[PDB]
């Protein structure tokens, strides 16, 4: 008949409790010891400059009102009781369309220790916003943040801190990486303060460091473009007396470049900067267009010195650009 003890204690615990007020109002700051266990680092939405992340968002805070002495040190509570006791309104500063999973029942527990050290764990799928500066594309690496802090409480009423050492408070599961074009290199955290008009607030930043995986692009777009410029340079190899052959080869080169450029744009969102595709595709476009112009010059000239010199010059220029570009963006941080 031990069920009666738990029923009595749990029922009588919440009497005289005012959910609206924070713990220890008017006598001390409420320290919320947070911690995150990333169940899975969802896909990085390159187009929308955001990423999805599934997290077990744990967070504990001392509360003297919910103090009980009983046979069991820890009293697991159902989701119904979780709403009837105060909880930190820890919103995400860069969150966008976040969802709390509810299948089967709400994914959130709330354990009250004897002293009153609540542990409010929940499962989320926050789609935080990651401002991406895709200027060093595709080598671009981004330190996507996950700023989160209280909404209604200033720095003087609710202060967030990591329950463990900051380095050991954002744990990512080994198999949780769902990235298709990135690599979660590591994590870094900090606890700053935000100066808002209505007051000061405390923010618990966590910078997830991501490096784009060049494997997909280097084969989808770069290699076909390099092939095409080689084909354009092959057009010089053909004898000048065969006008139609060089004409059709030259026009085919630019048709191919058009196709590749069209494919490239759909992969990434709008970017008004000299991104990788912009720079490299433009340079290759100019190379093939110069091949067409060179053949036009050859056609008017009528193998002669001019043709051979013009042919040999270009591949050195293309190799120079490739070396400069690759060595640049590889070393750029």
């Amino acid at each position, epitope marked *: 008949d031990n069920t009666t003890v738990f029923t009595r204690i749990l029922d009588r615990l919440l009497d005289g409790y005012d959910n609206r007020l924070r713990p220890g109002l008017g006598e001390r700051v409420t320290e919320v010891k947070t911690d995150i266990f990333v169940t899975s680092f969802g896909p990085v939405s390159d187009h929308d400059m955001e990423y999805t992340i599934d997290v077990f968002f744990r967070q504990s805070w001392k509360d003297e009102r919910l103090k009980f002495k009983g046979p069991m040190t820890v009293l697991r509570l159902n989701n119904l009781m979780a709403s009837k006791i105060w909880t930190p309104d820890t919103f995400f500063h860069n969150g966008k369309k976040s969802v709390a999973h509810n299948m089967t029942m709400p994914n959130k527990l709330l354990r009250i220790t004897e002293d009153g*050290t609540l542990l409010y764990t929940m499962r989320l799928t926050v789609r935080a916003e990651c401002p991406m500066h895709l200027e060093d594309f595709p080598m671009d690496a981004h330190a996507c943040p996950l700023k989160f802090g209280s909404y209604a409480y200033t720095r003087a009423e609710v202060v967030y801190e990591w329950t463990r050492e900051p380095a050991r408070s954002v744990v990512v599961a080994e198999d949780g990486s769902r990235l298709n074009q990135y690599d979660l290199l590591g994590q870094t955290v900090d606890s700053g303060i935000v100066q808002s008009s209505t007051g000061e607030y405390v923010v618990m930043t966590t910078h997830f460091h991501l490096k784009r995986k060049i494997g997909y692009f280097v084969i989808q777009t770069y290699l076909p473009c390099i092939m095409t410029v080689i084909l354009s340079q092959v057009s010089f190899w053909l004898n000048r007396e065969s006008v139609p052959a060089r004409t059709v080869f030259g026009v085919t080169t630019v048709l191919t470049m058009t196709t590749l450029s069209i494919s490239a744009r759909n992969s990434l969102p709008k970017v008004a900067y000299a991104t990788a595709m912009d720079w490299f595709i433009a340079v290759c476009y100019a190379f093939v267009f110069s091949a067409l112009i060179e053949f036009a010059t050859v056609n008017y000239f009528t193998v002669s010195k001019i043709d051979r010199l013009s042919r040999i010059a270009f591949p050195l220029l293309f190799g120079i650009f490739n070396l400069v570009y690759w060595a640049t963006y590889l070393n750029r941080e």
Partner: antibody
Amino acid sequence: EIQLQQSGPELVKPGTSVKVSCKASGYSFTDYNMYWVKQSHGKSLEWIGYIDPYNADTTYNREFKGKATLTVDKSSSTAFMHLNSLTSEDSAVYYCARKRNNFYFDYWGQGTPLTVS
Amino acid sequence: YIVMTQSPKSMSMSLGERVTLSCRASEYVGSYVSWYQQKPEQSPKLLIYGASNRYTGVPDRFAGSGSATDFTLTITSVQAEDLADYHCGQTYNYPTFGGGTKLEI
């Protein structure tokens, strides 16, 4: 105010274990982790390990892994450090800190002189 | 672990002058870099926590700074009570303090 009283100076031959305490009275003992640090003469502070008094969860530095045993007495509101297999290097002064939050060690003990010979 | 490097080994300066004590962390430590002052035969006393926040009861002349790895503690006007060893102790990872720079006349 907060007072961190430690055991007085002691002298012992090598190899014999010792016990040094750390009494905190100002604040509720179980709230904050109690850190233990070592500082040899003229040298820097060296972290030994910290004990979470509430659940007695303990962590030690790798060098001191098995060198010092941290135990706590919530009833007495005191933190004890038990050293064993004492050697020449162990001669130093040990303080017990008090980690208020992730930033700073709020309060420090008086420092216990330990000499081995 | 993270190794702290008190670049100035022992600075000596007369009273009423500016002195800055650097503190380098081997790895990223965020803003969790405290500063402590240890008078001879006395326990350390905190001066600056966070990166620049000043602990209560500290004279205003003490002032810190530092973003990720480079942290500096500046004394606007050294006085007769500022002569002691100063250690910077991070807490981002497990604690690891610095060598301790000595201050003299």
